Design an enzyme around this catalytic site. Structure first.
Site, mmCIF file in Angstrom:
data_model
loop_
_atom_site.group_PDB
_atom_site.id
_atom_site.type_symbol
_atom_site.label_atom_id
_atom_site.label_comp_id
_atom_site.label_asym_id
_atom_site.label_seq_id
_atom_site.Cartn_x
_atom_site.Cartn_y
_atom_site.Cartn_z
ATOM 1 N N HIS A 74 101.581 35.116 71.998
ATOM 2 C CA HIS A 74 101.497 33.687 71.745
ATOM 3 C C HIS A 74 102.856 33.181 71.271
ATOM 4 C CE1 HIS A 74 100.248 29.862 69.951
ATOM 5 N NE2 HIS A 74 99.156 29.962 70.685
ATOM 6 N N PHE A 112 94.470 31.209 83.592
ATOM 7 C CA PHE A 112 95.473 31.246 82.531
ATOM 8 C C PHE A 112 96.555 32.195 83.039
ATOM 9 C CE2 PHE A 112 96.837 31.211 78.018
ATOM 10 C CZ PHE A 112 96.606 29.865 77.752
ATOM 11 N N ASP A 145 104.001 30.992 69.242
ATOM 12 C CA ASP A 145 104.157 30.894 67.797
ATOM 13 C C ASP A 145 104.306 32.274 67.176
ATOM 14 O OD1 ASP A 145 104.019 28.096 67.764
ATOM 15 O OD2 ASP A 145 101.830 28.135 67.750
ATOM 16 N N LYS A 146 103.531 33.249 67.651
ATOM 17 C CA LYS A 146 103.675 34.600 67.127
ATOM 18 C C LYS A 146 104.957 35.253 67.614
ATOM 19 C CE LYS A 146 101.505 35.412 64.648
ATOM 20 N NZ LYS A 146 101.447 34.898 63.259
ATOM 21 N N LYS A 194 111.236 34.467 55.568
ATOM 22 C CA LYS A 194 111.596 34.188 54.187
ATOM 23 C C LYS A 194 111.651 35.484 53.393
ATOM 24 C CE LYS A 194 109.413 29.667 54.364
ATOM 25 N NZ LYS A 194 108.621 28.653 53.624
ATOM 26 N N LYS A 198 111.802 33.170 48.120
ATOM 27 C CA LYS A 198 110.985 32.043 48.555
ATOM 28 C C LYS A 198 109.556 32.272 48.092
ATOM 29 C CE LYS A 198 114.615 31.256 51.182
ATOM 30 N NZ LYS A 198 115.884 32.003 51.016
ATOM 31 N N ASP A 225 104.102 26.593 77.087
ATOM 32 C CA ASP A 225 103.806 26.186 75.720
ATOM 33 C C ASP A 225 104.980 26.511 74.806
ATOM 34 O OD1 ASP A 225 102.531 25.212 73.529
ATOM 35 O OD2 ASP A 225 101.021 26.798 73.396
ATOM 36 N N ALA A 226 105.437 25.541 74.022
ATOM 37 C CA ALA A 226 106.510 25.798 73.077
ATOM 38 C C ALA A 226 105.963 26.473 71.824
ATOM 39 C CB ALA A 226 107.222 24.501 72.702
ATOM 40 N N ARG A 258 104.004 28.071 62.512
ATOM 41 C CA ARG A 258 103.066 27.087 63.028
ATOM 42 C C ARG A 258 101.659 27.641 63.182
ATOM 43 N NH1 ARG A 258 104.701 22.273 65.806
ATOM 44 N NH2 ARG A 258 102.780 22.324 67.046
ATOM 45 N N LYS A 259 101.429 28.882 62.766
ATOM 46 C CA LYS A 259 100.121 29.528 62.793
ATOM 47 C C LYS A 259 99.796 30.080 61.415
ATOM 48 C CE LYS A 259 98.404 28.963 66.864
ATOM 49 N NZ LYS A 259 98.765 27.542 66.616
ATOM 50 N N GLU A 300 114.064 30.003 60.920
ATOM 51 C CA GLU A 300 113.049 29.465 61.810
ATOM 52 C C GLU A 300 113.446 29.757 63.247
ATOM 53 O OE1 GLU A 300 114.507 27.641 59.474
ATOM 54 O OE2 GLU A 300 112.922 27.129 58.048
ATOM 55 N N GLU A 343 119.274 29.375 57.314
ATOM 56 C CA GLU A 343 120.328 29.750 56.384
ATOM 57 C C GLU A 343 120.161 31.210 56.002
ATOM 58 O OE1 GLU A 343 118.352 27.195 55.997
ATOM 59 O OE2 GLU A 343 119.638 25.429 56.203
ATOM 60 N N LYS A 382 94.365 34.350 72.993
ATOM 61 C CA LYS A 382 93.846 33.482 71.938
ATOM 62 C C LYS A 382 92.352 33.713 71.822
ATOM 63 C CE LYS A 382 94.808 29.597 70.608
ATOM 64 N NZ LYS A 382 95.278 28.299 70.063
ATOM 65 N N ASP A 399 107.057 30.716 48.803
ATOM 66 C CA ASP A 399 106.099 30.519 49.885
ATOM 67 C C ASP A 399 105.517 31.842 50.353
ATOM 68 O OD1 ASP A 399 106.419 27.749 49.904
ATOM 69 O OD2 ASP A 399 108.097 27.849 51.309
HETATM 70 C C1 SAM Z 1 112.427 26.219 51.474
HETATM 71 S S1 SAM Z 1 114.082 25.820 50.855
HETATM 72 C C2 SAM Z 1 115.095 26.947 51.850
HETATM 73 C C3 SAM Z 1 116.502 26.398 52.058
HETATM 74 C C4 SAM Z 1 117.521 27.378 52.629
HETATM 75 N N1 SAM Z 1 117.187 27.692 54.010
HETATM 76 C C5 SAM Z 1 117.590 28.642 51.781
HETATM 77 O O1 SAM Z 1 117.421 29.754 52.278
HETATM 78 O O2 SAM Z 1 117.815 28.585 50.576
HETATM 79 C C6 SAM Z 1 114.409 24.228 51.655
HETATM 80 C C7 SAM Z 1 113.975 23.015 50.839
HETATM 81 O O3 SAM Z 1 114.697 22.929 49.627
HETATM 82 C C8 SAM Z 1 115.007 21.580 49.320
HETATM 83 N N2 SAM Z 1 116.318 21.522 48.646
HETATM 84 C C9 SAM Z 1 117.557 21.657 49.214
HETATM 85 N N3 SAM Z 1 118.489 21.556 48.240
HETATM 86 C C10 SAM Z 1 117.861 21.364 47.061
HETATM 87 C C11 SAM Z 1 118.328 21.201 45.769
HETATM 88 N N4 SAM Z 1 119.630 21.218 45.523
HETATM 89 N N5 SAM Z 1 117.438 21.016 44.736
HETATM 90 C C12 SAM Z 1 116.086 20.996 44.995
HETATM 91 N N6 SAM Z 1 115.629 21.163 46.283
HETATM 92 C C13 SAM Z 1 116.500 21.343 47.300
HETATM 93 C C14 SAM Z 1 114.966 20.812 50.631
HETATM 94 O O4 SAM Z 1 114.289 19.589 50.483
HETATM 95 C C15 SAM Z 1 114.220 21.716 51.588
HETATM 96 O O5 SAM Z 1 113.001 21.128 51.967
#
Ligand code: SAM
Ligand code: SAM
Ligand code: A1LVL
Ligand code: A1LVL
Ligand code: A1LVL
Ligand code: A1LVL
EC number: 2.5.1.6
Lengths: 373, 378, 383, 339
Positions: free
Chosen positions: C17, C238, C19-20, C273, C277, C246-247, C252-253, C45, C58, C169, C279
């Site tokens: 897929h 299919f 997205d995967k 990440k 992070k 499909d992009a 996104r999943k 990403e 980054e 899917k 997240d």
């Molecule tokens: C999930 S972080 C990851 C950013 C980068 N790719 C990294 O690896 O550090 C991205 C988010 O941080 C937020 N952001 C960027 N600079 C910031 C700052 N100086 N203070 C607070 N938030 C910030 C942005 O709004 C963005 O949505």
């Protein structure tokens, strides 16, 4: 040393429809044609970049037309012959990225200032040098053999280079023979070198070059590298207008430097190059010269040519002052009138993208004008 | 009478094609600094808010393409959106791959390393200037350099990086050589800002730039001046145009004089005869001209991929020598070894001295190994 | 009884897929960096479409990574190796738009900070969830969907069914009965499968093979009845699938990755990440907390929420919801979590070894429910 | 008996929301000329680059450069000093110009007149207030990018939640290089927060994380990449209810990811506003369930007792309005009209 005191060698190369630079040139001309079909007044300056599985279009196209760039690019690539990953490219799954700045929109001015050279040598019936003619014919023969299934191991990419031994003749050049010939055509993993070289020597070279030019001393570099399988955009990046010398005379004469493909009539580096070729072919076919070069420099905004010069290589009874006066009398070189004289608004530009812009009959700039002097 | 006109063009460091050329040579230098043997072929595409590097770079070096590209653009002078480009926020896409193994097949001793690709390549030298270069291209390059100098030191703060200085000169023939009489036409069109009025720019270009570059013996009262012929030219640079590596090949070498083999220079290392052989042919031509053999000479070499030696060599002295092209060819063969593997040693083509060549012509500047004539022994 | 039971659906997507594809390529880049620089700060990403993979983000690290090789090896492992399939690792386009981590975040997060007290890589809320209806402490629907996709991949890769292709899917609708706050799965009400194939195979053959060779070998007979509904290849052809047709994008999943609709999601993607992070790190830690509570006997079905603010190491808020399946009021469970679990990123990295290159394994078939990962190892609770 | 719940939101300048707004702008541009246009547009925003991918089958002729640049200009990025400029940004169109499943959730809670959770409502209001103060020149040091987070304290009422007070607030808004931290943190407190959150929710114990990073000058697409549909939870309920994983922006009615989510929200708001429930969740899946949280007199069996477009007019170009500040809780949209 009577042989070598009036003899020289001149090389010229050409590249087949599969060469990534020619892929880009052909796609740019395809986009230009697609626009000109619907809006003959379209102002198009397109640049194509071909990389591994990527076609990128970038430039400025102001026109009333609605063009499907995906379809145009993929049809052009399909016509080139790349239709499988095994060949290094596939029109079905290649990536087309469009970065065009399309925007809603005689004494018209020039598109930009530029040197533009035209040249005509009567050593061939097409009034073109023999070296580039032979190189283009070799590439065309390779494409023909690949497309009709005679040699199924051929692939779209190919590069050819012909070195011709010439002798001077009171300012003109007469081709004595073919000193060297180099062929490098992409192939598949199955065929062996011996078969490829034998086929290229016999089926291709001997069916193109008249036997009066080939003798037992001719040097043959057929597939000199020894393995050419990774080719097309995969084996090298390509850009529009990176093969400008291959397009015009293969070294002979000179080049202003401006690319041809992707540009419409108002971009003076194409229309004026065609006009200078027309002037040179008219002078050569009009009997005035046997080998002529015409330099025309246009400035942006300013309509009339900014400079004109002629060099007949001492092959005329008329000092190039008289020839330049004749060119002024017979030829109006403003872009606005060049359009009407050469019908540069017709979608006849992809035909010029491969195997040279000159020396082919079906083009209005290849029909010499009747000179009145 | 024996009088003609000849034009030649040149474009400033801001011209998108030259942005691409400088970025390509900057990547090549970045690689050559760490890996002198790096095999680099890097085409560059510059347009509105985008720089794209595509090509094949096989090397042991580790390069930060973001810094290379952005510092090259900063040195060019594009550092604000008001100018149509900004190195800080421009987009750099890297599509670089490894050199195709098929080419690497044609590994071997250095002295007999085969050509990187087939093709014909020209050199040319005319002694009408102390640099053995045509006057028109020299003047065009000097006009671009003067515009850049005035812009960068703040003398004319309404200038902007893009420009196109491009000159027509009247010439007279003398036994196969050419002597420039005067400058028939001069065209200048340089990007500027909105706040400045047209009359001021035209007056400044006529006085500040032209008078400080072209010797007064060439400028007459009949000279034609097309300064900013298109009115306003505010939208320039990668915006309002598009660039590519090697799309200004004639501007690089002789501005129409002699001939060109169609091969781009920028982005290629020594194995690519498109660059090495062009440099070697320029070296041969300048050696013949400085050696007194001829006043104006053209040389052609041709290579085939995988074949080290040239396939063909030709000379044309334009009738400006006592020596027929046969014995000039013999002199060239005796004095010059034109294989790429020996050219690299003779011209030190492994040094990171390539970005300096990206702007204002590859020739006519003294600091380059191919611009020092060889002591001919015949 | 239709009055005391309900239906719940969950979907999953195979390694092919788009997205995967993007998620797996992002995790491959992260692994390539973590192999050389355990402290690499990565946020990648990936965007995949016909003949194009684009990496944007980054990455601040000391490592030297060959992005072309990493991407192409990941795509090859996925199984796209010919134009006839709509994608080819050899001739696909890889564009790299990677940059350095913005200095503002670098100074506001980790520069000149001891490991134990590095602030959250970014603000946001993150959820964890555990349900004891399966030995993996995961909902039955997502488990079954992931296992169906895994079986399709296994059959394709070993040549048993040579007409399969990487994209797929699945979506399982399961009939549950409520049981004092917990849920007990009764049967599988519906199953829909749609897997990319080739032109030369007939529809009846694919439907029969999916009915017999795939579904019967994954779903226990306890759940399959004669009334179960089967939408096997419900869209006829299919054949144009994968990035072509499909992009795709990274992250996104996200629901397919965690619980297939059960519990809740904080909206944050996982793939690409590193440990800084929240997240990803905080989601893993919340899953660890929930599985520890469920496996420790405290609950049978638990949900945990944590929230962070950029630059503040400690969680801003923590919340528990045991769904009325515990003797301990959410205050007691929250005190247990506070006493026993330290949820700072800098201590999470040490407690879960989030610096090891073990992230591509999580890119496909869900981040949870597989015992090989540290966050799937319950912690001995002390209260 | 109380608990805490957090919810976040992101302003029009957030790169993910730049991508979402651009996708919806392309969808609108198509829907104005071809109501039957089949659009699936993904957008990627990076430093000085906007990339459009996906598939669009329609009879319309759209100027993607113009649409993208006008959307970016409306967002507010018009200078390199801000990290992005619509004039000089790069728009790459990879759309496949063509020849003409999943599970979704809806949710409605009557704790606010908009039938939405208080936390996401406050987060969206804070982002909107920052946008208003940036666009009318009240605080010229603001930049388009911003992220907000509200942690609210809740108490239960027979399966329904009633908010007590705002436990925490986090604001991180991009600014310029000139203003100092003290001024920003005083302005974000007195001018933004105090003008949005009713004083009955703010007390002396509230925790304010205003500009917790310290420096947020580098932002927008330059400071982080963005993609379409990477902020799905911010779009719908900020963690409340549940999500089917499907992105909204860039999709037309045929995509149940968008139209069916709208239909489920319509069903949930109809049940809550019709009086049957006080907090309801609906779950649909294509190729149905309800959970009223115990706030109804009738079990889910009695509450459970491609044609959406006719009833929600999903063919009208009203989709960019939904791209920023949430798809729900706003009056003007047809799915926000209970039946
Ligand atoms: C999930 S972080 C990851 C950013 C980068 N790719 C990294 O690896 O550090 C991205 C988010 O941080 C937020 N952001 C960027 N600079 C910031 C700052 N100086 N203070 C607070 N938030 C910030 C942005 O709004 C963005 O949505
Ligand atoms: C060899 S490079 C030429 C310049 C430089 N090497 C580069 O990559 O840009 C690519 C060109 O060489 C040709 N080529 C690629 N592989 C070849 C091979 N194995 N043998 C001969 N020619 C080849 C292709 O036609 C292509 O135009
Ligand atoms: C023997 N011979 C007779 N005519 C020519 C001729 O027109 N060119 C040439 C080719 C391309 C461009 N310009 C020229 C002219 C010499 C300027 C030559 C170039 C070389 Cl290297 C060697 C020989 C010739 C030659
Ligand atoms: C007066 N005159 C004296 N020498 C030359 C000369 O070398 N070239 C030229 C320029 C560029 C390339 N090749 C040539 C040679 C003529 C082949 C000219 C080209 C033109 Cl259009 C007009 C005049 C000359 C000329
Ligand atoms: C019968 N039943 C027993 N437990 C649950 C349950 O936890 N969820 C659910 C699913 C996903 C997210 N949140 C929930 C909770 C209801 C909030 C359901 C959601 C729906 Cl549509 C229908 C029934 C249930 C249900
Ligand atoms: C105190 N309280 C009262 N109602 C709820 C509620 O609906 N959720 C929730 C939030 C998001 C998704 N699903 C849920 C339901 C618990 C499944 C909560 C989630 C947490 Cl972490 C903590 C407390 C609650 C809560």
């Amino acid at each position: 040393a009577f042989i070598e005191e009036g003899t020289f060698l001149f090389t010229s190369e050409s590249v087949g429809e599969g060469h990534p630079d020619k892929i880009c040139d052909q796609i740019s001309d395809a986009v230009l044609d697609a626009h000109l079909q619907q809006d003959p007044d379209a102002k198009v300056a397109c640049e194509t970049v071909a990389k591994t599985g990527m076609i990128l279009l970038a430039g400025e196209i102001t026109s009333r037309a609605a063009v499907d760039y995906q379809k145009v690019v993929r049809e052009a690539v399909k016509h080139i012959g790349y239709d499988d990953s095994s060949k290094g490219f596939d029109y079905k799954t290649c990536n087309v990225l469009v970065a065009l700045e399309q925007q809603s929109p005689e004494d018209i001015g020039a598109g930009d200032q530029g040197l533009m050279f035209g040249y005509a040598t009567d050593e061939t019936e097409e009034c073109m040098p023999l070296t580039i003619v032979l190189a283009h014919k070799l590439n065309a023969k390779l494409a023909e053999l690949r497309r009709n299934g005679t040699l199924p191991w051929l692939r779209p990419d190919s590069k050819t280079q012909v070195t011709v031994q010439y002798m001077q003749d009171r300012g003109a050049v007469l081709p004595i023979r073919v000193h060297t010939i180099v062929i490098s055509v992409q192939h598949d993993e199955e065929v062996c070198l011996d078969e490829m070289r034998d086929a290229l020597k016999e089926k291709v070279i001997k069916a193109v070059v008249p036997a009066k030019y080939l003798d037992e001393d001719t040097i043959y570099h057929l597939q000199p590298s020894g393995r050419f399988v990774i080719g097309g955009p995969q084996g090298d990046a390509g850009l529009t207008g990176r093969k400008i010398i291959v397009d015009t005379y293969g070294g002979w004469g000179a080049h202003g430097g401006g690319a041809f493909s992707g540009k419409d009539y108002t971009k003076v580096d194409r229309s004026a190059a065609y006009a200078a070729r027309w002037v040179a072919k008219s002078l050569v076919k009009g009997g005035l010269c046997r080998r002529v070069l015409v330099q025309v420099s246009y400035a942006i905004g300013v309509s009339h040519p900014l400079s004109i010069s002629i060099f007949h290589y001492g092959t005329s009874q008329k000092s190039e002052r008289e020839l330049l006066e004749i060119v002024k009398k017979n030829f109006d070189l403003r872009p606005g009138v060049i359009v009407r004289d050469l019908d540069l608004k017709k979608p006849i530009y992809q035909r010029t993208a491969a195997y040279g812009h000159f020396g082919r009959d079906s083009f209005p700039w290849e029909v010499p004008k009747k000179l009145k002097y």
